[PDB]
Design a protein around this ligand. Sequence first.
Ligand code: HEM
Ligand code: HEM
Ligand code: HEM
Ligand code: HEM
Ligand SMILES: [Cl-]
Ligand SMILES: [Cl-]
Ligand SMILES: [Cl-]
Ligand SMILES: [Cl-]
Ligand SMILES: [Cl-]
Ligand SMILES: [Cl-]
Ligand SMILES: [Cl-]
Ligand SMILES: [Cl-]
Ligand SMILES: [Cl-]
Ligand SMILES: [Cl-]
Ligand SMILES: [Cl-]
Ligand SMILES: [Cl-]
Lengths: 309, 309, 308, 309, 308, 309
Amino acid sequence: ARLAPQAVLTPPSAASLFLVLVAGDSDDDRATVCDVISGIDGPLKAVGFRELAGSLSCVVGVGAQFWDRVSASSKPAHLHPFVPLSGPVHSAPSTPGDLLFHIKAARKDLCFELGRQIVSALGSAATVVDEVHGFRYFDSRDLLGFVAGTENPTDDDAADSALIGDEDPDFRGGSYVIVQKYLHDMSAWNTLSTEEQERVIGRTKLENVELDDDAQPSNSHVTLNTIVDDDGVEHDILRDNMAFGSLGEAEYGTYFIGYAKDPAVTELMLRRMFLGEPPGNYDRVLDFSTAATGTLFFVPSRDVLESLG
Amino acid sequence: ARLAPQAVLTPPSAASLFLVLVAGDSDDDRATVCDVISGIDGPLKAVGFRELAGSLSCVVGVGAQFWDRVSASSKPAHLHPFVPLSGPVHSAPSTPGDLLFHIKAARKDLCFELGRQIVSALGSAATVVDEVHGFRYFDSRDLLGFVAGTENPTDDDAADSALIGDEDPDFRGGSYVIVQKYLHDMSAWNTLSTEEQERVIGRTKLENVELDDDAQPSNSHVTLNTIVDDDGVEHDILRDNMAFGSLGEAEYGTYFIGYAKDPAVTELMLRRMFLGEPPGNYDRVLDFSTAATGTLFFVPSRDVLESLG
Amino acid sequence: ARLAPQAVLTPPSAASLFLVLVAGDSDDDRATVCDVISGIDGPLKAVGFRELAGSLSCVVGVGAQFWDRVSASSKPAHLHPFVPLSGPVHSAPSTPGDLLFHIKAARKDLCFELGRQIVSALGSAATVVDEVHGFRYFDSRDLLGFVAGTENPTDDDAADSALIGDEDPDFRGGSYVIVQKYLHDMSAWNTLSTEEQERVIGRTKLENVELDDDAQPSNSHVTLNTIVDDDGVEHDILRDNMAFGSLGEAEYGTYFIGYAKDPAVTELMLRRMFLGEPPGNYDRVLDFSTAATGTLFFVPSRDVLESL
Amino acid sequence: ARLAPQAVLTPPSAASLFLVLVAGDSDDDRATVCDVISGIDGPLKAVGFRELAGSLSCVVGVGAQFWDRVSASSKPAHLHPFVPLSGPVHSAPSTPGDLLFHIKAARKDLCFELGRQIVSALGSAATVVDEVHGFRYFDSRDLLGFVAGTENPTDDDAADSALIGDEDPDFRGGSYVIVQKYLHDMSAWNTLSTEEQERVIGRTKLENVELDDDAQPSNSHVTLNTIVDDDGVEHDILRDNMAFGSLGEAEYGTYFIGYAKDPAVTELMLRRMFLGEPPGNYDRVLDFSTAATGTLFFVPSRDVLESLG
Amino acid sequence: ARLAPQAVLTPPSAASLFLVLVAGDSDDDRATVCDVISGIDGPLKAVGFRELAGSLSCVVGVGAQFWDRVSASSKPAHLHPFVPLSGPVHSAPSTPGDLLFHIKAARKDLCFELGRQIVSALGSAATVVDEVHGFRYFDSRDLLGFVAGTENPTDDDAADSALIGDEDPDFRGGSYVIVQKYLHDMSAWNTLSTEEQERVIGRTKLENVELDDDAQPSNSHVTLNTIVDDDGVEHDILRDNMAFGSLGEAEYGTYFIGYAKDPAVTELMLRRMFLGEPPGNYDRVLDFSTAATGTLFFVPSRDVLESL
Amino acid sequence: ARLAPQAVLTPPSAASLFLVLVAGDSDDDRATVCDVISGIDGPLKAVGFRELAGSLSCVVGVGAQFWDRVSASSKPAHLHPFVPLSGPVHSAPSTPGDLLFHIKAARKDLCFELGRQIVSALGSAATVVDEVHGFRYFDSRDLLGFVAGTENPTDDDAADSALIGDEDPDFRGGSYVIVQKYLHDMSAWNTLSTEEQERVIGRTKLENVELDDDAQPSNSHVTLNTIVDDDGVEHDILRDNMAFGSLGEAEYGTYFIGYAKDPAVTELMLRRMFLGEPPGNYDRVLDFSTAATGTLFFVPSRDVLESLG
Ligand code: HEM
Ligand code: HEM
Ligand code: HEM
Ligand code: HEM
Ligand SMILES: [Cl-]
Ligand SMILES: [Cl-]
Ligand SMILES: [Cl-]
Ligand SMILES: [Cl-]
Ligand SMILES: [Cl-]
Ligand SMILES: [Cl-]
Ligand SMILES: [Cl-]
Ligand SMILES: [Cl-]
Ligand SMILES: [Cl-]
Ligand SMILES: [Cl-]
Ligand SMILES: [Cl-]
Ligand SMILES: [Cl-]
């Protein structure tokens, strides 16, 4: 898929732009927004075509809110605002956002330039609330120094885990994406030993090998984020997390972003993480990282997105 | 589609070679031509395999006259010679050619070497009448200075536009391709201002953005080459244009090469360009660009190409 | 096909690792091997995910004997051990192997690391019996100096040639791989003129152009390995050969590895090469190449592999 | 020069980190700072070595201020705080900074990681005041869409323009660097025509050709920034400007950073720019860009830097 | 040596452009040419700065006649027009050229753009008389199939070979370039066996290994082009040859371009090639290659060029 | 230093080949050896020229015994056989070799092909006694998992450390090189914890940071291999180590290869490693690493190498 919007299954990139906007209530504002997103291939190609490789992509997400202002008579089975969470020790907020632009490419400039054009073409119809500049950190690691994205599904597995299928035929090819902008306590995480961090995560640090069944804490991030139903079948998400940061504000982030054909799966994950399972037995990763955003979007197929207004 | 002939859908490349030949009148000549072209996979792999990336591609096209010499009793539905056009100041001549080899690669040497092996296999059975060595010019710009190919369709839309379908099943997967070798008047074009040049084209020069509707001349290249039928269905073509030129002979060129499932679309675009819409409202790009060739070829699918003889 | 096990159709790579292993006798050995190979995408992702490009792949093969030790319930239609061949001048031995890991990547480190992890996780449950580190040699050449892999099928022809289909649907998506480690007699090869070598292979050397029909000897490698059935349809295999060797031992090698949906095609190529067509008209490439191994494996699809 | 600090003459990079810090008054603070900078090759190599190419570099700059707290008995001929400017229309501030880290590399991660380690190793001894993440924007352009850095000197020319020579023998191999973090008025600049912008700058936009003597405004950025002494000899700086920005804050920047063997040259340039020459005839670029920082640093040779404390 | 004019010592590149021009008669022509060439680093930076890598280079050469039209005050010690050679079978013509632009870059677009700019800025003051777009061919080969440039001197030997020194200090840092556009007779070359071609060149074809002393013919290109003085010291030139051609015209070419601090070395190679050593023992490469141009230029250092 | 033999200063590469040979006893053997090695530029270019980047390099080294057979009456000042060491549990054996070819390239095939041509030119006049195919392992790490070569000197410092100077003018520009082929006990090493492994080495594992003084064991690899003379002058060596190994034979290796103007420095480092400082305080890396070879070679400059015979 070269320079098509709503390409959910694109592999990891060296650079990322995550843009979250809220729209004006204005019916002008709402129509401008609809011109821009419904013709998103326009700027995508306009920018992306300028690089031989065509690495640029752009997934547009529409919040449950704004989706209702533009398509009253039609709705995907699982679209809703982000379910906030209140656990024993840690809390997942549910912040504002109508529009998500998930931009990826082999270079920063291509990313930013597409962002410049999307923002410029929306003028006053929308306002940027969250902006993360994602980046690859060494051999695909988060700023906690672990290889990040290892166990994502691929090929058919990824398509099945992430894209709306027969189960909701009106919106085939779409997805539900949840973002959370985590900031990290670097000095705290650094007081742990490698082995403790490995215990927290679920896998060895340098070698990125998953720990044995008998060495794996019942509250390792891995165990918490593994989902098996009654019949014995696993359910996966597709994560496109990037690192970001600012040195003189001491921010060191993991930008979480997970796509799934049904947000139930992501949501259960988030519950097992914040509330724990057994309850109270929560995800130790949360000790070292706090969510500062939390938002859910529907990712329309190319067709659905092209008809809006 | 790695090292397969008739890969119409290949993304743009850094180098290309376009060869147009005329076949000898003889029965020998016809048979040699058929062997070489029906067996084009041989040279394709012989050269292309030597590069790890396998970037080399080769699309063979056959003119209407030569087709009738070779397969009298089976003809793709829309194969006819190039339709010349004559406006009051600018014309599209119809120039000879029985064979097109449209060759693309990441490097010159690959395109050249394949050309050599093809020309050599053809020996005296065919004669080159046009030869153009295409090259990528900065960030996918043409010699007029504009990003070039921005609006080409990709993925499914590309297949939908370029490749014969249910309409003409005996040749599904083939295409119709048109070439025109345009030379530019750089002087005249340079005496325009950027803002005028943009008005000629239909997009901003540097940033490659489409001009919005109320700033968009009715005889802009973009506008004139937009094809919406009465039912409001858009009809696209697939363009693999490349810069080319010679400093000593002051040639600065654009090699037009457009693929379509039905050449009616390409031909309509052309008639809107040369004869204007409404009539006399011609494409100002033609004030600065003069076509020296105009030839139409049928691009058979692999199975059809392999059967020839 | 990013970071998936059993990706038979991957394009060529700069580096590869061919690992052949024998499994231990015990039921415990059986289970450790089965546990490792069934979860192969674990290590495959553990190392592969670390390279932006995602070039790393890993095809697992299972030999007939070991397949029987895990699944006498159903067998791929053509799975059997490798058939030795004993020709008038040269022979192709049949040699042990229970498991094959055919690993490809853009970098040696990735192949090596994935191997390290696989070999480690198998521990005493298995023994490496052959190991060769392949590498690309100039413009896709082999150590004999010829461009090597030119006429592989690609795209659909590749899938039609290599992947088991309707003809054996319980194992749809798998394949049959045959491997042979060849060592060359370099001085003997260099006593030939370029023209003689071209007549041996059946293509020109520098340019890699097929010799035409009447300059083509009947015993050219290319002729002997052309398989056309009674209806005129050609049957192709998919070869992922790499160069290897060792300067100190004077080993200059071609690692042959050929995938096919029906290994009789590959086997018939072998018979025509070793015994000749007509008999005695054997492949003169064999006058400069001696095969030190010979092993056949079934390549389960992801589904069947995951269930093992 | 692979992985050596104070490598002033390294060619352009795809990524940049500009860090400006101020030090604590604390004599601990001052000694920590001196350990970190005097052993700067330590973290440079620690990070840089991890990339085969070794693209990472780091120039340390020491403000005139702090330089005096650490080397009382020795001073470079032209070290002083940044001379602020007050012109007819526009003003160049002179902001705080003791330490400059000019970091460059082929990737973001390498940049940031070196920054992480420099900041972490300074702990509370210093505080980040300015942090710019530089990036390459297309074919070496600033966010004003012009090719940026064209006329820099190279080879010997660059060494002579930038490195302290015979004229101040104690500090041979060092440099004076001035930074200014400009923000741009994008909507204003976009109301000009290409030709007007060309007039402002001095060179053609797309083609990056310098205008003819007779077409060149006496107040084009180029003319203002050309320096010729009494004898007829030119004097050049070496600029390593990068683009940066933030979309939802509408910041679009040129991070200016010029090295010279004598800041007189940079300073005269800045005067001709802000005050004009003839006076009042100032640099039109200033209409569309405002300096939000202004700081001057001495760049010690490797030897001088290694002995500090 | 990033984006500087007169960088003779640049390594090989994927693409090059060779432009030969004649200047107009008028004094106005003289001044426009001089203005353009003296400011050559303007366009060189205007296009070159646009590529991150900075691969673009541009060497300017000035012919003897035009040099005289601008500087009869001082002449490089060896500057004279190219000497035609008329041998027993083959001849090297002397053909017009007042200016040479030898442009190299990693990409065609850069070479082309710099040429566009140069040719434009010269307008009617000059005329392009020869233009060839060179390209790398496989693993540094020429269209005859041999690796081409193997024995160029490098590093210091390169500077010692190519750059004018103490022997003519008013022009320290310059050089002398000779260019000849050769066209090959491909069918004739292909009637030779590989062994015959190797004996012509003096190296093996695929492997690019020098033939040893007793398999080396006396009229091998390599032998004829070895220049050893009476004290035993070898004298080398620096060649930046590229392939070119046109499929429709059947032109398959080698663009010869040789730099030396003293062009008698290059000239003596030419005489030994065209007339033979001993006489009549000429270079059999010339039985397959015909030179269509022949021109000598002085390559001013940056300083002398800037002052023109 | 493009395609020149004896380029000791080459930056690290992705592939290498180390060959150690013993010369035949004969006069023929000696003369063949001298021809091949004095003419090594031939094979170097023959192979290396075929790659555009020209990454291929080849450094020839000559052992003390063979040197004395070849140039009896002229000997670099410090050429002697490798000095064996025997600690109580760990030893450095002294193993045969008259010739070293240290070959580096960006690709395996280049290193291999050069090796072939060299081994073939030598024929029966020499026999390979050690052959190692080095490869870059992730981000310049060795098989123990640590970034490896971090502290090598670069630029002038490298030249200063590695290359014979005024001390021994007849051989200025040469060097002395020592090789040791170490095999690791991966099991034993893996039973350590990261923090212990770091203590063994002297730097953090993942982030490659030097441990500060008060956390830095006196028998850390780093500490023991730091060489300060009485005058406080540091003495460095240049290391081109590479990973290597064989999965079937459970070999996981580090090929040590250190260059020095004076081997006294390398030999002292070694004696501090094997015999400890103070005595018995040995380098714990040796608990996990066992050397199978130990050979010293003189690396002549080009002019000297070319004269041999
Ligand atoms: C601070 C934020 C986070 C960090 C630093 C983090 C880091 C990790 C790491 C190091 C792994 C192991 C390697 C891999 O497969 O990617 C992992 C796996 C995973 N993570 Fe998290 N993660 C974070 C937040 C989350 C959140 C909020 C979710 C769910 C909404 C989540 C879902 C998963 C899933 C589904 C896997 C695959 C586990 C498996 O099946 O083996 N991650 N992440
Ligand atoms: C004469 C030389 C030509 C030049 C310099 C030229 C230039 C351009 C440029 C700069 C664009 C905008 C970027 C893009 O989407 O490709 C464009 C678009 C287009 N051109 Fe042309 N062109 C030429 C000949 C033609 C011809 C002969 C045809 C039709 C037969 C044509 C059909 C199109 C089409 C279909 C588009 C996309 C229109 C849209 O839907 O936005 N081009 N061309
Ligand atoms: C908003 C800030 C600025 C922008 C966007 C800007 C942009 C430019 C552009 C487009 C050029 C022409 C191409 C080139 O050679 O780089 C240029 C040249 C130059 N600039 Fe500026 N510039 C800025 C600030 C400055 C400042 C503050 C100085 C002096 C302190 C300066 C010194 C120069 C010099 C010395 C040249 C070379 C001119 C020549 O000799 O031809 N720039 N800059
Ligand atoms: C046995 C296998 C070996 C392993 C795994 C090993 C590992 C290391 C590592 C991980 C470093 C830190 C990164 C760096 O600066 O290179 C290091 C530094 C060093 N190593 Fe070793 N090494 C080995 C053998 C040796 C030997 C035999 C010597 C001396 C003859 C040695 C001399 C050094 C030196 C001089 C440094 C830099 C010390 C400093 O000044 O910080 N290495 N080595
Ligand atoms: Cl961005
Ligand atoms: Cl995650
Ligand atoms: Cl071509
Ligand atoms: Cl077009
Ligand atoms: Cl390996
Ligand atoms: Cl084969
Ligand atoms: Cl950064
Ligand atoms: Cl500037
Ligand atoms: Cl060109
Ligand atoms: Cl030559
Ligand atoms: Cl090797
Ligand atoms: Cl070491």
